[PDB]
Symmetry: C5
Subunit: 216 residues, 5 copies
């Protein structure tokens, strides 16, 4: 029953932390040129569900791991009962506007929109998604298989406000559905920097390239 | 009688106010929670062999208990439980790990809270998930599986359990296109390379065949 | 014009007095409620033999009465009833027990409150539910059934009743792909070994065949 | 000019605050009935499904009514004679198709125009699926279908309906639709039902159509 | 650095609070305070052409640009901030609408706009649109031609004017492996008067000529 009090105190500690972080000097306005952010992206490809040769749309199911770090989300665990991290609704915090650049339907969200914040200010958010995107599956019924590609990146921030990185250029296939209609030959995820004549600012994306064929 | 009813309303409204808008940041490693899960399988509606997706309709019973939802019935005119919008309370982020479409909710999002702090919530859902129905048109049938668990909490914050490993088939639709050969619901613990925390899921395994 | 303004003020006042003043948390064992249900079947839209789902369009009349919603007309300029958004009041969680898709709502979610505290709410719905249409292409036709009832309240908090066991077919679409041979709506009471309470539903049973 | 438009902006803001607060309207009643004028502009018969007997129309429905509680004197507000407003800011009539098979899909912004005499105009564009047997659409005489529109919850004692014409506006009908329009009418009907002593009013939209040739 | 980033954050948070609260909701354009919206299309894909219903499905980015005096500030007064990103829900946006859609537009990008210190706003929603279009001849060298008008649903030319910076649709991002190739795409401002009404009506007519890729 002291165990009850210790539990009540841990709750108090976490609630205070959250109120201190979110309400005390409130909602972080997103990155700027004077305060840029790096977002790390990683894909875990679960399934190629559908490949439509009449419209050249392919549907993927994946988890997209997003990580970034804000000084405004830092705290000292010692001031809050040694709390080192917490789960919070993604609506409680700023999240990056990472967007598939060649989708053909709105992304469908398959996982709860909850993120983990750690005491150093780092945030991890892993939305599971079903995505329809522009892909010609010609060759999928061959040994060579088909190849498609889709870029992901911020919609509204240039490379001067949001930089992107990957930890590896290999997509995680370790949870790929073993009985999919389609087998994966390769899946890569590569940071690209784009440059345009009009504009001094660079544009950054991550190119997801998947080669696949009908599983015999 | 009408005045006694007026009284009972007042005590209920006061209980809800005392519990909700005068007193929870979810579970933690120091304040962990156990969620009991149980499935009642109503129908295998569709098995798509062109995409390897199967669609189920089930009721998913969720149960957990919070100290912060306890009260003494004697303080509130002998109220021992109440119904409330699921939005009024914390609910667990129990998620199918291999869904291919967002879950469609078929029932009112209302839970029952009991004076001991226990909550029961039973959403009816339609789920599309990853499943190769090959063999469904044979005597042996097809076998598929989908894991449910928290998306964001490890076993250090949320544990899971089932009251039985037998999925409840007593409301399975008798004229479904597919008959159920077996349905099981099993707590599993995953231990990892990366991480020291255990991860818990319940594995729903369905063996079925064309009726 | 002044008197139309007064009738507006009476109604605004009644509504504020009932809603933003007075505290109804739904029915309880000590303050139970009876919901009357009646169905008007408009169309069997689709019958899918590949998945055994059938799609209906109907109006579901719901009626109940709360003391907390009554008033004296003479205190409010002889107002005897009013239309209000269904979000302004408590409504029952009447649910189809064997749907396969979320219900699609076809009508405005507005109810009528009467001075004796009675409420009428008639949602028009399209429902997909579990139904094997085998026989639909035969003289005998097909038969399907779907139960409706509270999701969360047992018979000790919400009782159900019908005014008749005949589904209203007077608005059934004459050029539907399916002709209705019969449609009934019947109150049922069940027990489950889990639980000591009675459970109540209204069973909608439709017998139909392909129009010739 | 910058200051004049600062004023114009302030005056409109004031008008709206003065109207949507300051006696904030519970809809029509038998003592304070309302007439809603309806008219249809049929743009396209998109789809005719003979497997389920549902047909899909695209149209604009012009709705007009007048409330004294939305009147003002333009001279008190910088000669503002009308304004655009979110439909969520005002009362709107619950005009409903009585034989839809799916929820209506809204194709236009839900914004209305209010004029200083209290009159409102709202023109929602809609895609509607309704109960229609397309048998005969592949013939010279075509198919005929109908759908009634009216209030869901108010009788003719609270909301009366009217049309300005019984001819549906076909001047924006898509010329390369799969279906040609042979006729389209919109007719106010009064109905009486055994249940109830009060009159019920609808507008019957009747469309005669065939496959384009 | 942490304290300088704090001041920068503080300057923005204060700008966003001075603009939004403090002279709140702009009630939209009026005859006395009219607005010009510049529109441009970047056509990415013709996804589908349905000849059983005469609907065609397009994916494009629609660039919208307008300027409000109520959104201006002096950068010198706010730590030299010259622009910011904001939720499109934080601001007034124009009710620009396709006049012959057959289904609600599906939004494919974040609803976030960029506000610049001169009071200008840029908003670039990505959309999938189904519209009225007979694709007959798409399987021929001459191809099919369709057209859809874009404009305010509720404001006339007296409140909202429209303009294009160019009559050529941007095809530099058109999907190279689409089922349909683009023969041409133009975006043309049109002024109409109708006998009902004295006000001018303005729209931008998107005209796409296309055929099956071979
Ligand atoms: C902003 O920049 C201008 C020009 O470089 C300069 O004169 C002014 O001092 C700066 N103001 C600040 C940092 O507040």
């Amino acid at each position: 029953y002291k165990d009850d009090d210790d539990k009540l105190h841990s709750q108090a500690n976490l609630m205070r932390l959250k109120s201190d972080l979110f309400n005390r000097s409130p909602m972080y306005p997103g990155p700027t040129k004077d305060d840029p952010l790096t977002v790390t992206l990683g894909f875990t490809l679960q399934d190629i569900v559908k490949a439509d040769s009449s419209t050249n749309e392919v549907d993927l199911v994946y988890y997209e791991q997003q990580r970034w770090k804000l000084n405004s989300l830092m705290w000292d665990p010692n001031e809050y009962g040694n709390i080192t991290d917490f789960r919070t609704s993604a609506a409680d915090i700023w999240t990056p506007d990472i967007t598939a650049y060649s989708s053909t339907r709105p992304v469908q969200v398959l996982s709860p929109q909850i993120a983990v914040v750690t005491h150093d200010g780092s945030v991890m958010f892993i939305p599971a998604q079903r995505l329809s995107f522009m892909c010609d599956p010609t060759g999928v019924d061959s040994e060579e298989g088909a190849t498609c590609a889709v870029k992901f990146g911020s919609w509204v921030y240039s490379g001067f406000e949001i930089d992107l990185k990957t930890d590896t250029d290999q997509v995680d296939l370790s949870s790929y559905y073993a009985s999919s209609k389609y087998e994966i030959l390769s899946a890569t995820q590569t940071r690209q920097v784009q440059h345009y004549s009009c504009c001094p600012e660079p544009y950054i994306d991550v190119n997801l390239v998947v080669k696949f064929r009908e599983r015999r």
